């Protein structure tokens, strides 16, 4: 009857990602469901280092470009229908919500 449902959230903005995580956890505490999380995976830092100059003249200066990806994992012990209702709420821009049934 009760199943462990895993919700994964990814985003480039920390505040938006944290805001959605609080809403889901707070939205599940209202239904008195068991909640495990949020679990914060290590931040993925995509890095691109490139020559600033469009040509090869001058001092060799480099720009270090970073694109940080923050990942959150939330586990809810409830039926898929209840989880669907909680996650149906509008999500902040840039936050990707992925709901899957944990294989255990």
């Amino acid at each position: 009857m009760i199943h462990k449902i895993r919700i994964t959230l990814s985003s480039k903005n920390v505040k938006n990602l944290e805001k959605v995580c609080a809403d889901l956890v707070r939205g599940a505490k209202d239904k008195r469901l068991r909640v495990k999380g949020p679990v914060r995976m290590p931040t993925k830092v995509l890095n691109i280092t490139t020559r600033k100059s469009p040509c090869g003249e001058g001092t060799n200066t480099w720009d270090r470009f970073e694109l940080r990806v923050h990942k959150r994992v939330i586990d809810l012990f409830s039926s898929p229908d209840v989880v669907k209702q909680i996650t149906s709420i509008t999500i902040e821009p840039g936050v990707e919500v992925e709901v899957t049934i944990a294989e255990s």
């Binding site: 995509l46 691109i48 490139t50 020559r51 600033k52 270090r64 970073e66």
Partner: protein
């Protein structure tokens, strides 16, 4: 006409923005030349921190 294989090497790959075949950034599948990427780096989502 165009019979020579183009399965690998610089000739097969070109910048997706300008079409130039030099200084292609293949990391993460960007497929953009170093000049085009720097111009569009902010829009793509890359930022300079340090």
């Amino acid at each position: 006409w165009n019979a020579h294989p183009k399965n690998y090497g610089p000739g097969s790959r070109t910048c997706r923005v300008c079409g130039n075949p030099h200084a292609i950034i293949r990391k993460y599948g960007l497929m953009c030349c170093r000049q085009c990427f720097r111009s569009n780096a902010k829009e793509i989502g890359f930022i300079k921190y340090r």
